[PDB]
Copies of this chain bind each other. A is one copy, B any other.
Amino acid sequence: NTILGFDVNLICDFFLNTERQGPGSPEVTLKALSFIDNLTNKSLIADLGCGTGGQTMILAQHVPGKITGIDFFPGFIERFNKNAEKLNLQNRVKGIVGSMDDLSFEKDSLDLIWSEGAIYNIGFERGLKEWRNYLKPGGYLAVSESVWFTDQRPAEIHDFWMSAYTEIDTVPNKVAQIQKAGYIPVATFILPENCWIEHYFAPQAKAEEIFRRKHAGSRIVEELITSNHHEAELYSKYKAYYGYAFFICKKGF
């Protein structure tokens, strides 16, 4: 929780005070889940890039099976596990510090891999390919990912994204990639705007004044808040052109 150095810790600390690290909502998590038909008490589930496990606790409360959440940051996993313990879920939900690009799950062992706002870390197509190896045939991967809504866009929004996440793409392109990677694109849907505003930007803005003051004079924290604002301003201006979508993918063969 402070083992990774203060520069990293300060950013985690910010997100420990906030609702969400990217767009999403409890309703959206449950709607993605509504497309998964294979789960039983014997299911093994992984949540990759789980952060503090907010969406993981929603899964756990709505599906049978055992869930392992993997995240790079001990501070998040500390929160994840404390939250599981408050809910009494710890015998079936466990948070582990680990890296999405270096997993040690048994091949073809998982019924479900979940990942909200996190596959961009390893890359959409790379995650499709690598993670497929850990899924049972007929198993599911459910991931939320940045997308373009249209064929043509203003250069201003196009450029921001080329500098942030070069893998943003159109929904038809993402769906093509899913099929190319050997899955069936069973369900794909765009997140409503409340996933970005009420559930993400708004609570984020709410926490900023107090956090900035608590860490008065910290450049790392100032620049963070400045980024947060830029991201939020671009969205208010260009949301006609982009958003997030959930992709539910069934491993083929």
- A residues whose Cβ falls under 8 Å from a Cβ of B: 31, 34-35, 37, 149-151, 170-172, 175-176, 178-180, 184-190, 192, 252
Does the CB pair A188–B175 fall under 8 Å? yes
Say whether chain A's binding surface is mostly helix, strand, loop, or mixed: mixed
Among A172, A179, A180, max chain B CB count under 10 A is at A172
Provide the residues of chain B in CB contact with A172, threshold 8 Å. Answer: 172, 175-176, 178-179, 185
Partner among B37, B150, B176, B188 whose Cβ is within 8 Å of the Cβ of A187: B188
CA distance in complex: A176, B175 (Å): 9
Tell me if B170 and A179 are in contact (CB < 8 A).
Answer: yes
6 CB contacts below 8 A, A to B, read A149-B252, A151-B180, A175-B188, A184-B190, A186-B190, A188-B189
Residues of chain B within 8 A (CB-CB) of A149 are: 184, 252
Cross-chain contact B35 with A150 (CB below 8 angstroms): no
A189 in complex: contacting residue of B35, B150, B170, B178, CB < 8 Å: B35
Contact with A192, one of B37, B178, B189, B190 (Cβ below 8 angstroms)? B37
Further pairs besides A175-B188, A187-B187: 18, Cβ < 8 Å: A35-B189, A150-B252, A151-B179, A171-B175, A171-B179, A171-B184, A171-B185, A172-B175, A172-B176, A172-B178, A172-B185, A175-B175, A176-B176, A185-B188, A185-B190, A186-B190, A187-B188, A188-B189
Q: Which chain B positions have C-beta within 8 A of A37?
A: 192
**How close is A217's CB to chain B, nearest CB, in angstroms?**
45
Q: Which residues of B contact A190 (CB under 8 A)?
A: 184-187
Q: How far is the CB of A174 from chain B (nearest CB, A)?
A: 9
For A185, the chain B residues whose CB sits under 8 A away are: 171-172, 188, 190
Nearest chain B CB to A148 CB, angstrom units: 10
Complex Cα gap A151–B178 (Å): 11
A243 to chain B minimum Cβ distance, whole angstroms, is 9
